[PDB]
Design a protein around this motif. Structure first.
Motif, PDB file in Angstrom:
ATOM      1  N   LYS E   7       0.816  -1.209   0.000  1.00 28.88           N
ATOM      2  CA  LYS E   7       0.000   0.000   0.000  1.00 28.88           C
ATOM      3  C   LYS E   7       0.853   1.263   0.000  1.00 28.88           C
ATOM      4  O   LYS E   7       1.346   1.690   1.044  1.00 28.88           O
ATOM      5  CB  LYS E   7      -0.932   0.013   1.217  1.00 28.88           C
ATOM      6  N   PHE E   9       1.477   5.434  -1.798  1.00 36.29           N
ATOM      7  CA  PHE E   9       0.707   6.649  -2.047  1.00 36.29           C
ATOM      8  C   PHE E   9       0.609   6.993  -3.527  1.00 36.29           C
ATOM      9  O   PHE E   9       0.132   8.068  -3.891  1.00 36.29           O
ATOM     10  CB  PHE E   9       1.324   7.827  -1.285  1.00 36.29           C
ATOM     11  N   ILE E  63      -5.597  12.325  -0.148  1.00 37.73           N
ATOM     12  CA  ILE E  63      -4.448  11.427  -0.157  1.00 37.73           C
ATOM     13  C   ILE E  63      -4.841  10.021  -0.607  1.00 37.73           C
ATOM     14  O   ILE E  63      -5.349   9.227   0.185  1.00 37.73           O
ATOM     15  CB  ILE E  63      -3.800  11.322   1.245  1.00 37.73           C
ATOM     16  N   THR E  65      -4.502   6.330  -1.235  1.00 37.64           N
ATOM     17  CA  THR E  65      -3.686   5.245  -0.704  1.00 37.64           C
ATOM     18  C   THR E  65      -3.784   4.053  -1.649  1.00 37.64           C
ATOM     19  O   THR E  65      -4.680   3.218  -1.524  1.00 37.64           O
ATOM     20  CB  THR E  65      -4.154   4.818   0.704  1.00 37.64           C
ATOM     21  N   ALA E  90      11.189   4.114  -0.336  1.00 35.99           N
ATOM     22  CA  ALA E  90      11.074   5.115   0.715  1.00 35.99           C
ATOM     23  C   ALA E  90       9.624   5.327   1.139  1.00 35.99           C
ATOM     24  O   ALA E  90       9.306   6.302   1.819  1.00 35.99           O
ATOM     25  CB  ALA E  90      11.677   6.434   0.245  1.00 35.99           C
ATOM     26  N   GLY E  91       8.746   4.413   0.734  1.00 37.95           N
ATOM     27  CA  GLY E  91       7.345   4.535   1.093  1.00 37.95           C
ATOM     28  C   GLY E  91       6.444   3.512   0.428  1.00 37.95           C
ATOM     29  O   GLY E  91       5.716   3.834  -0.511  1.00 37.95           O
ATOM     30  N   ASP E  93       4.331   0.493   2.271  1.00 37.47           N
ATOM     31  CA  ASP E  93       3.915  -0.396   3.349  1.00 37.47           C
ATOM     32  C   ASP E  93       3.773  -1.813   2.804  1.00 37.47           C
ATOM     33  O   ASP E  93       3.020  -2.048   1.861  1.00 37.47           O
ATOM     34  CB  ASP E  93       2.574   0.059   3.927  1.00 37.47           C
TER      35      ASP E  93
END
Lengths: 38, 127, 96, 225, 98, 206
Positions: E7, E9, E63, E65, E90-91, E93
RNA sequence: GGCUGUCGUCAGCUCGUGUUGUGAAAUGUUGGGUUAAGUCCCGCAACGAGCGCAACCCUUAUCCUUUGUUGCCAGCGGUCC
């Protein structure tokens, strides 16, 4: 200052390496005889 | 064999399967008369059908689930009309004439800040 | 936001923890059908500021309690700036 | 036309493919043309960019390693790598302790295939000494040196990223031999036997097929003029 | 069978982060039933632009997701032990629960 | 007011986030918080470091942090000075192993931030706004770029009547999302008032 | 300072050069059609350019490629339907 700090750290490392090989080895050798005798 | 036809309108999802014969119509384990029959004007679903002599013609097995009556009824009409076009890709003109081949792009509206209902602006008797 | 105000909250947290957060749980038992000892109900008043309801959040950036959002802990304009400056991860204008 | 078959596979690296039915002048021609293609135009994968920990540039010496950074960079060129799906992949060499770095040691992720478990990269000669370099691999056609790579870069602040001369050629050596043969009803027919040596990142049957396809694309334009 | 979730962004990262699995985490050992998109969790917000007054201001943010499932459908050892070799992003999950 | 942020409006396309990472309502609350403390501080001890932006990557309990600066060496330290300090300062501030990679700023005359922090600093140096605002910023047009709109707030020079200034070159179509522009602010608390400034550098089109 | 409302999503606001008047200033940007619009097409002592308007962004309206869990069930099969 950065060079002279690095040169000072390396100088402390080199002379301590001499004191850890010889003076650790000599100190343990003298202590080992004292433990056996005593 | 069979001929599928998606069809939809106003958050609706139509799924009609036209089979050769059996003028029976079922929508989600229900009758076109027991789910829609005796409503506002659910005579639109079987509209394109009769539009070209049905009943003793082919079969209609639908599976819709989206939007209220009006819409859910409009979707099917779209799927069906779309479907028949498969059994015969030379009847588009006819169905298009009525306006079934096309979908009702006219969807709902989004509310807006400042307003009170996407368009209904707040009153100010004194200005 | 004031400096004094922006300080009280800070404490209202600590005390509302060193006690209630784990200690209130104790009296919460007696002061509830767990078979309501008066003494326990009275002992409930030992503190005051020690309460999880005496906190009004306040902007995590400035302090303005009006316009809070647990998400960014900021207050309106703060979220506004941080957002435009991209300081806030994955968050741009919303249009649909 | 010739029928491609009889693959005498000696090792993982070396091989000897043959093409039995060939005309009187078809032994040298195709073989010599394929030799020119195989050596010059051969798609592959090799090291391009490398970033070492606790090293600002090359021509320095890392603590706990006998081999210099310049010597390590040369060993990195010799290391064989083959990527299936990915175009570019970044590996990480996490290892420490007294002894040589076998060859693998890297974390195995994605589609990155490794064919060398003995190939020496560096030797660790101290207890606490540690190394952790991120190694980059790139896909290309031919030889691209380090001198060319510093021209159309535009903003290359990573000083730690010590560059290496890229070598995108799987073949080590090539050699064809034409020998006479007597097939089921024949007078005079050459037998083209293509001996090929590779780094081990691409099959010999896959390499020869890709080499012949390159010549067909070049010859396609020559017909219609 | 171990299930994996991703998950992020946006696809700018959720893409490579996922393709990595299918490529690396899926060679021959791991089975992998397939990479699915799954519904996105949209969370928008309305904030008063002007500082104090002018209710008719407000600004809308949001935002997205982005998520992905995929999950490997084969609990082996040679291939199910080559995923840990991936912790960049760097992002992104990556809830690796079973 | 009547202008959309020429940066946030594009945060979606042609413009990356100066802090990309994931988080959930739980830590997200204190997360963006620390990022502020660390970012706000990294400037305090590195003002004259001529730092541009300051990204903040976050994989898992190990933020990256990239301090882009026209003056890298000064942000480096005596072969470990600066780096060590910062890289260590990120201790309890985030309670996690926080790294720090510096990024060299190419052509410090095309980067908004700098061109902004500079003009403002010159103002504080008792200098005519018009001169610097124009010339000391005109450079962004000599090292390339196509268009640069500057803007100086009011209270410029001895006067109680605050006034804004123009001065722009090339073209700065901030009405184009596919335009991509380098916008940034910068204050200058002087003897009186806080003369502001806004840099609008149009770095090519799409 | 920063930030906001408003005329107003209105089509408007200007500049370089050239030319015109002693000059403020004009011309351009007016005129004829035209468009949601200084949008466009002719004209014309003006020729070009910038901020705008349009177009890039999202979103909704059809179909295609791809992947198929918690989503789906057209067929075939087994039904604690």
């Amino acid at each position: 200052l950065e060079i002279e700090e690095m040169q000072l750290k390396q100088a402390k490392k080199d002379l301590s390496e001499e004191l850890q090989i010889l003076e650790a080895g000599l100190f343990s050798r003298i202590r080992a005889v004292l433990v056996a005798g005593g | 064999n069979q001929y599928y036809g998606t069809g939809r309108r106003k958050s609706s999802a139509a799924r009609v399967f036209i089979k050769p014969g059996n003028g029976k119509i079922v929508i989600n384990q229900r009758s076109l008369e027991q789910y829609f029959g005796r409503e506002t004007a659910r005579m639109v679903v079987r509209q394109p059908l009769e539009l070209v002599d049905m009943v003793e013609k082919l079969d209609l097995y639908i599976t819709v689930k989206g939007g209220g009556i009006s819409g859910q009824a409009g979707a099917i009409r779209h799927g069906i009309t779309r479907a028949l076009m498969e059994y015969d890709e030379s009847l588009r003109s006819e169905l298009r004439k009525a306006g079934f081949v096309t979908r009702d792009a006219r969807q709902v509206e989004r509310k807006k800040v400042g307003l009170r209902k996407a368009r209904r602006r707040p009153q100010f008797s004194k200005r | 936001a004031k400096q004094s105000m922006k300080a009280r909250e800070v404490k209202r947290v600590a005390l509302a923890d060193k006690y209630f957060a784990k200690r209130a749980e104790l009296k919460a038992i007696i002061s509830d059908v767990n078979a309501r000892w008066n003494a326990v109900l009275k002992l409930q008043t030992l503190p005051r500021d020690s309460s999880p309801s005496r906190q009004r959040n306040r902007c995590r950036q400035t302090g303005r309690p009006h316009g809070f959002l647990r998400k960014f802990g900021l207050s309106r304009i703060k979220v506004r700036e941080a957002a435009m400056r991209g300081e806030i991860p994955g968050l741009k204008k919303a249009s649909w | 036309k010739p029928r491609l078959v009889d693959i005498e596979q000696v090792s993982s690296t070396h091989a000897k493919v043959t093409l039995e039915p060939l005309e009187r002048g078809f032994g040298h021609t195709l073989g010599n043309a394929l030799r020119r293609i195989l050596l010059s135009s051969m798609p592959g994968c090799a090291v391009t960019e490398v970033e070492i920990d606790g090293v600002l540039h090359e021509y320095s010496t890392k603590e706990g390693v006998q081999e210099d950074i310049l010597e390590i960079l040369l060993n990195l060129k010799g290391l064989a790598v083959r990527v299936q799906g990915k175009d570019e992949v970044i590996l990480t060499l996490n290892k420490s302790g007294i002894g040589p770095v076998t060859a693998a040691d890297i974390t195995h992720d994605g589609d990155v295939e490794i064919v060398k478990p003995q190939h020496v990269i560096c030797h660790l000669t101290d207890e606490n000494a540690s190394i952790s370099m991120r190694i980059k691999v790139q896909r290309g056609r031919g030889y691209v040196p380090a001198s060319t790579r510093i021209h159309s870069e535009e903003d290359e602040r990573p000083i730690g990223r010590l560059l290496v001369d890229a070598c995108y050629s799987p073949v080590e050596r090539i050699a064809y031999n034409v020998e006479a043969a007597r097939v089921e009803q024949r007078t005079d027919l050459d037998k083209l036997v293509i001996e090929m040596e590779t780094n081990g990142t691409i099959d010999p049957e896959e390499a020869i097929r890709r080499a012949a396809t390159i010549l067909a694309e070049q010859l396609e334009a020559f017909v219609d003029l | 069978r171990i299930r994996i979730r991703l998950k992020a962004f946006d696809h700018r990262l959720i893409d490579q982060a996922t393709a990595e699995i299918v490529e690396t985490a899926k060679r021959t050992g791991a089975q992998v039933r397939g990479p699915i998109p799954l519904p996105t969790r949209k969370e928008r917000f309305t904030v008063l632009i002007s500082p104090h007054v002018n209710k008719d201001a407000r600004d809308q943010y949001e935002i997205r997701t982005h998520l992905r499932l995929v999950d490997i459908v084969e609990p082996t050892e040679k291939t199910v032990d080559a995923l840990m070799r991936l912790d960049l992003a760097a992002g992104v999950d990556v809830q690796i629960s079973l | 007011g009547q202008k959309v942020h020429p940066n946030g409006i594009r945060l979606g396309i042609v413009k990356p986030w100066n802090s990309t990472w994931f988080a959930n309502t739980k830590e997200f609350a204190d997360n963006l918080d620390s990022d502020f403390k660390v970012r706000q501080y990294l400037t305090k001890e590195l003002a004259k470091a001529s730092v541009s932006r300051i990204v903040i990557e976050r994989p898992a309990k190990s933020i990256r942090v990239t301090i882009h600066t026209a003056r890298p060496g000064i942000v480096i330290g005596k072969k470990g000075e600066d780096v060590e300090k910062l890289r260590k300062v990120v201790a309890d501030i985030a309670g996690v192993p926080a790294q720090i990679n510096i990024a060299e700023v190419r052509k410090p005359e095309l980067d908004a931030k700098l061109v902004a922090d500079s003009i403002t600093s010159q103002l504080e140096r008792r200098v005519m706004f018009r001169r610097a605002m124009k010339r000391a910023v005109q450079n962004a047009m000599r090292l390339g770029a196509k268009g640069i709109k500057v803007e100086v707030s009011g209270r410029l020079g001895g006067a109680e009547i605050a006034r804004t200034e123009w001065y722009r070159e090339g073209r700065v179509p901030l009405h184009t999302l596919r335009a991509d522009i380098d916008y940034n602010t910068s204050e200058a608390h002087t003897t009186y008032g806080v003369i502001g400034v806004k840099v609008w550098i149009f770095k090519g089109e799409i």
